[PDB]
Amino acid sequence: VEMAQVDVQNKIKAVEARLPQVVRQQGLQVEASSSGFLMLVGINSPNNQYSEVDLSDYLVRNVVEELKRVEGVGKVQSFGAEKAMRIWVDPNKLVSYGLSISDVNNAIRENNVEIAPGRLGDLPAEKGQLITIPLSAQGQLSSLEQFKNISLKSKTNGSVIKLSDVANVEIGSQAYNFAILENGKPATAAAIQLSPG
Amino acid sequence: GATAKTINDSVVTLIERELSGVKNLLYYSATTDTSGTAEITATFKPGTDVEMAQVDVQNKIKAVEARLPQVVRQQGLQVEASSSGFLMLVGINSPNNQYSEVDLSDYLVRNVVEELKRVEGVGKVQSFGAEKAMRIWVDPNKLVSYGL
Amino acid sequence: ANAVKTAEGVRAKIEELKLNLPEGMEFSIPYDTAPFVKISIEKVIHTLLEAMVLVFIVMYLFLHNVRYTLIPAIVAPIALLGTFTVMLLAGFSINVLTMFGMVLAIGIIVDDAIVVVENVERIMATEGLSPKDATSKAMKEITSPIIGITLVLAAVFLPMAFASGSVGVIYKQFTLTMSVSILFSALLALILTPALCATILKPIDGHHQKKGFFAWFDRSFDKVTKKYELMLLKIIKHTVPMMVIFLVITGITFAGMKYWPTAFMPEEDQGWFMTSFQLPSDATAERTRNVVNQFENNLKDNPDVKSNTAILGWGFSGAGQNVAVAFTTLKDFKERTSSASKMTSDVNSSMANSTEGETMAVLPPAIDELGTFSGFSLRLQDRANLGMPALLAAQDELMAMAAKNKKFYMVWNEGLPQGDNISLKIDREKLSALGVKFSDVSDIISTSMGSMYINDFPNQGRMQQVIVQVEAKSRMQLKDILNLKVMGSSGQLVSLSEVVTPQWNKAPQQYNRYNGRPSLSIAGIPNFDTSSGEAMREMEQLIAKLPKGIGYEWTGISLQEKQSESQMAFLLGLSMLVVFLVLAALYESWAIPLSVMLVVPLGIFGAIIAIMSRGLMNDVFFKIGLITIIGLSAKNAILIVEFAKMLKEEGMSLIEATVAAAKLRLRPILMTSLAFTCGVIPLVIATGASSETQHALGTGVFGGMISATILAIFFVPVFFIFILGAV
């Protein structure tokens, strides 16, 4: 099963010149698996404490990463996604100010930015330098309240509007594809497939 | 450029997620420091064929290059099974102080260290000098005096 | 790849580059290892050739004629030349472990041919019989021992070949080289030596004028074999108080093998060592250069030192400005006084008072690709999410206990220590109140301390780089970053010191990881007069005093050492169980193969005595010596109890049979024994380079064969009378 897997790895790298860029910017997995389920580990909440976007967030950050450290676990499919920062824009309020979604996208890129760290006293240095020390700057945003104050420059009258006036900012799931029932009650789970050999 | 804190979260913990499952393993480790690079070492059982174990790890990190940042993939990921020791150490000096050390290291990269690898059985050659470049040392006080 | 061959093609390639060098540039190789690889292998081959002639001398001191001695002398190379083909067809090589297996083999591959030429020396001298008819009457008596001696000695090295770990590969080199060499000498004792002894021997009659230094040896030997029967006839009367000594002898060995310290491989002097520097976390490279320059001026006046390279800014286990490593090469052995293990201590005493950081000179490892230095490796990892500051606060609990144990000597940690950071916090509301775009603040910080690579340019036949960086005088203090200015909306410049606020903290600079867990890599070398396994078990005592949730593991040379100690009782169990089974298949009983398994601890008794008088340890070379004694001391038992059992069924009783059977085979037993004893003399008295790895292999089989033969020839006639004399 491995000397047959190196045969197919020879051949698709002979066609990646002709594939589109958005395929190669997501890559091509080649993986020899079982096409079945060994077991199915789940997490529920009987007292309805946490909702299903919290249970699936707990499953990705903690559970499904250490389940693969067991030898013989080929892949683990999670049927829930971790949290994200979802911006639900209203396209009617956007054209009332003369904006576009490409302007909402560019405002987030300016205001939630990653600054390169650097050091202080790196080695093409002066004569007599005694202390070196790393330096860094916090450029990104952290909470909901910061995301609702990213300023947008209007194009109708030249006003100053925040992000919360043209959109709605919430913590939500990353992808909304799958959902899971377990006994009639909503939960989350992960499917475990065993390795070849 | 980045600190070892960020490489441990974005790069290192993604690759060791795949190695637990490579057969004939003994242990595996990883390390990071201030230089800006990481290195992960997988140690196999004594007697395992060193090439058919190298194709196992080449299967797995190409299953995580979707999730690595772009600046990692624009620099690639070397996978190379080496000795972690020094066979020998070839040097060049100048006893009459003719050439400085930026000239000696330039001579070593252009001429010496390229043809040393044409010897069969030389795995890698680490050079502890870099070739020349065009360095521009800007002054940020004179730059804002012109608005640049 | 190959060490000595790749190092020579590099040495050749440099010699062509001497021609195109400009005036003012010389090559230099100030650090090489393949000089030691070549010296160590001819030291083993020169050991093997001295081992042959010492075996050839004692064969000449017993048979008194050089035509007798060449008949088992020539079965030594053809058995070794036949083993070189088997190494090729199995993928083996020529290393010091295989050729140590031939130095051990020289004493034993002559044994299957010594019995044949000795036996025709009797029949040609006793009956006055012609050598062609003498050989056939000899071969009708001794064919049954050698077909038993071969299978009893080829089968003890097969259970040890199937061990695991790195010790299993060390046992294989000794298995294939020592099993099929006796198997090749078995047929060459049956095929070739009767062909020689029937032709190249003319009948020797009695020397009417017998003379020489050898003439005293033959008359005294018939005085000794007359004296040996009188002493043997005394102790079989007292066979019950002779057995009670035998339980006492076994009791010292069973405690001597459990209480003596253990190790893995003895460490040698390879002509070089390695210093490693580690300044604090904010040391610039000017501060590392002043530490190295003080280390250099302590080695300018020692006469033993040839060279000392240094690589500033890079070391094993981490690279940074506060990091260096030095390779220091000594002179060759005959010129040098003060060998290398003393010189690393003088570095570690004059560099613990003045030079600002941790400086540790260590010795090179035993096996090359198992580590970087000789010592033990520990991975102090946390197992339940305790966080990095708890784990770093857990090691200086462990680093405080190990500084006061006398079973240690400078335990330390491998890696970059903690340090200070500076983090800036941008005040956004103020920034928007001055009309300052956030995009222009976030890139006057980004392009302020790093370097930027733009594109290439042709520099006389090569494309080199164009790099843009801020000037060196404006990225040194924190206050040069807080005077960059950005344009507002009003029209004047706002400096960065008004909109940011620096704050210091303390975080690690290196994030190691081991088996999927966060860890710290702790190293350490054991104390003088204290073995590896002693220090390896006191470390795991002090780990049990840590905060709960902090695990540990062994890696590198130590994991292969702990794995080698769990398998010895199983490999010594099978290697004694197999020979007990195969002797019941040959001697057709259960009582007779019990009389051979009691001679096994009489040779182990000398194996531990010869260690404690010399102060070595219990390592993998001693365990190869133990399985050697198990097969070889059984050999001296099998020669007596085979001819005793045959003599009893032809019409003798038990007491008169073993007296005659031990008397008629004293001459072959002493011949093969001291040939193996003189076959390991160059292993015990070695002097030069790579001497210590020969002392470990040789002193176990030396005292083990002496205490076998001097105890066996008085004890297997005790065991054979008592076991068969039950009912």
* DSSP secondary structure of C68-93: HHHHHHTHHHHHHHHHHHHHHHTT--
User: Residue A14 contacts by C-beta under 8 Å, 6 or more apart in sequence?
Assistant: none
Report the candidate in C403, C421, C420, C366 with the shortest Cα–Cα distance to residue C522: C403
Q: Which helix (H) or strand (E) segment is C399 a member of?
A: helix C388-401
Chain A CB contacts of C313 below 8 Å: 123
Write out the two tokens for C722. 């008592």
CA neighbor of C55 nearest in space, from C80, C20, C90, C18: C80
C424: three-class secondary structure by DSSP: strand
- A118–B34 CB contact, under 8 Å: no
Burial class, C278, CB count within 10 angstroms (exposed 0-12 / middle 13-18 / buried 19+): buried
For residue C472, which residues of chain B lie inside 8 Å, CB to CB?
137
- What are C595's two structure tokens? 């009389």
Chain B residues 27-66 within an 8 A CB cutoff of chain C: 27-35, 46-47
- Structural tokens at position C284: 């610039």
Within 13 Å, how many C-alpha atoms sit on residue C219's CB side? Answer: 7
In chain A, residues with a C-beta closer than 8 Å to the C-beta of C472 are 124-126
Find out whether B95 and C26 touch, Cβ atoms under 8 Å: yes
Chain B residue with CA closest to C372: the answer is B85
List the chains bordering chain A where 3 or more Cβ pairs fall under 8 Å: B, C
In A100-119, the residues whose Cβ lies within 8 Å of chain B are 116-119
HEC string of chain B equals CCCHHHHHHHHHHHHHHHHCCCCCEEEEEEEECCCCCEEEEEEECCCCCCCCCHHHHHHHHCCCCCCCCHHHHCCCCCCCCCCCCCCECCEEECCCCCCCHHHHHHHHHHHHHHHCCCCCCCCCCCCCCCCCEEEEEECHHHHHCCCC
What residues of chain C lie within 8 A of the CB of A151, using their CB?
A: 432
Resolution in angstrom units: 3.0
Q: How far is CA C639 from CA C26, C76, C186, C716, in A?
A: 68, 22, 16, 10
Partnered with residue C550 across adjacent β-strands are: C382
Q: Which residues of C touch A125 (CB under 8 A)?
A: 284-286, 472, 476
Q: Which one of B23, B77, B138 would you mutate to disrupt binding with A, by most A Cβ within 10 Å of its Cβ?
A: B23
User: Which residues from chain A sit within 8 angstroms of residue B17, using beta carbons?
Assistant: 65, 68-69
Q: What single letter denotes the amino acid at residue C421? A: N
Interface check A30 vs B, CB under 8 A: yes
- CB B12 to CB C513 under 8 A? yes
Among A110, A116, A130, the residue with its CB nearest the CB of C284 is A130
Measured in whole angstroms, the distance separating CA C677 from the mean position of its chain's CA atoms is 22
CB contact under 8 A, C476 and A139: no
Backbone angles phi, psi at C454, to 5 degrees: -95, -65
| Chain A partners within 8 Å of B18 (Cβ) | 68
Rounded Cα distance, B38 and B7, in Å: 7
The answer to whether residues C526 and C561 touch, using CB atoms and an 8 Å cutoff, is no
The two tokens of residue A193 are 């497939």
Q: Mutate which of B59, B61, B138 to test chain A, going by most A C-beta atoms within 10 A?
A: B59
Pick among C287, C434, C438 to test the A interface (most A CBs inside 10 A): C438
Q: How far is C294 from chain A (nearest CA, A)?
A: 18
**Smallest Cα–Cα separation from C708: which of C628, C629, C591?**
C629
The secondary structure of residue C544, as a DSSP letter, is G
| B 2-41 residues inside an 8 A Cβ radius of A | 2-3, 17-18, 20-21, 23, 25, 34
Say how many C-beta atoms besides its own lie within 10 A of residue B70's C-beta: 8
Q: DSSP class of residue C298?
A: T
Judged by a CB distance cut-off of 8 A, whether residue A24 touches chain C is no
Spatial distance between the Cα atoms of A120 and A126, rounded to a whole number of angstroms = 12
Q: Judge: C3–B134 Cβ closer than 8 Å, yes or no.
A: no
Q: Encoding tokens for residue C449?
A: 């301390």
Strands C517-526 and C376-381: antiparallel
C-alpha angle with apex C270: C264 to C275, nearest 5 degrees? Answer: 90
Verify whether the Cβ–Cβ distance C464 to B131 is below 8 Å. yes
**Chain A positions in Cβ-Cβ contact with residue C442 (cut-off 8 Å):** 113, 115, 137, 139
**Cβ-Cβ contacts under 8 Å, C317 against chain B:** 31
Contact assignment for A30 to B34 by CB distance below 8 Å: no
The span from the CA of C183 to the CA of C219, in Å, is 36
Q: Residue C475: its chain A contacts at CB < 8 A?
A: 118, 120-122
Q: With contact defined as beta carbons under 8 Å apart, do A89 and A108 qualify?
A: no
CA B10 from chain centre, in angstroms, equals 18
* Cα–Cα nearest to C356, from C272, C267, C283, C421: C283
Tokens standing for residue C379: 């991975």
Q: In terms of CA atoms, which chain A residue is nearest residue B16? A: A69
Please list every residue in chain B whose beta carbon sits closer than 8 Å to the beta carbon of residue C369.
83-85
- Residue C172: beta bridge partners? none
Q: Do A31 and B65 touch (CB under 8 A)?
A: no
Q: Does C15 touch chain B (CB under 8 A)?
A: no
Distance CA C692, CA C162 (A): 27
Token pair 């194996």 is found at: C607
CB distance from A61 to chain C under 8 Å? no
- Best A8, A9, A132 member to test B by mutation, with max B CBs in 10 Å, is A9
Counting as contact any 3 or more CB pairs under 8 A, the partners of C are A, B
CB contact under 8 A, A136 and C423: yes
- Which of A132, A114, B32 lies closest to C322 in space, CA to CA? A132
Tell whether B4 is within 8 A of chain C (Cβ): yes
Q: Collect all residues from C whose CB is shorter than 8 A from any CB in A.
A: 282-287, 313, 321, 419-426, 432, 437-439, 442, 445-446, 448-450, 469, 472-473, 475-478, 481, 500, 516
CB burial of C119-150 (b: ≥16 within 10 Å; e: otherwise) equals bbbebbeeeebebeebbeebbeebeebbebbb
Please name the helix (run of DSSP H) or strand (run of DSSP E) that holds residue C534, with its range, or none: helix C532-542
The token duo for C634 is 């059984």
Residues in a beta bridge with C481? none
Phi and psi (nearest 5°) for C108? -105, -25
Tell me the three state secondary structure of residue C619.
Answer: coil
Q: Do C449 and A126 count as a contact with CB atoms less than 8 A apart?
A: no
CA angle, residues A143, A146, A150, in degrees to nearest 5:
145
Residue C2 contacts B, CB cutoff 8 Å: yes
Place of tokens 């770990």: C165
Whether the Cβ atoms of residue C655 and residue C676 lie closer than 8 Å to each other: no
DSSP structure class, residue C472: G
Residues 6+ apart with CB under 8 A from B45: B24, B25, B26
Contact A197 B23 (CB under 8 A): yes
CB pairs under 8 A between B and C: 189
Provide the shortest C-alpha distance from residue A166 to chain B (in Å). 31
**C116: Cβ contacts below 8 Å, ≥ 6 apart:** C71, C72, C138, C139, C142, C146, C189, C193, C194, C197
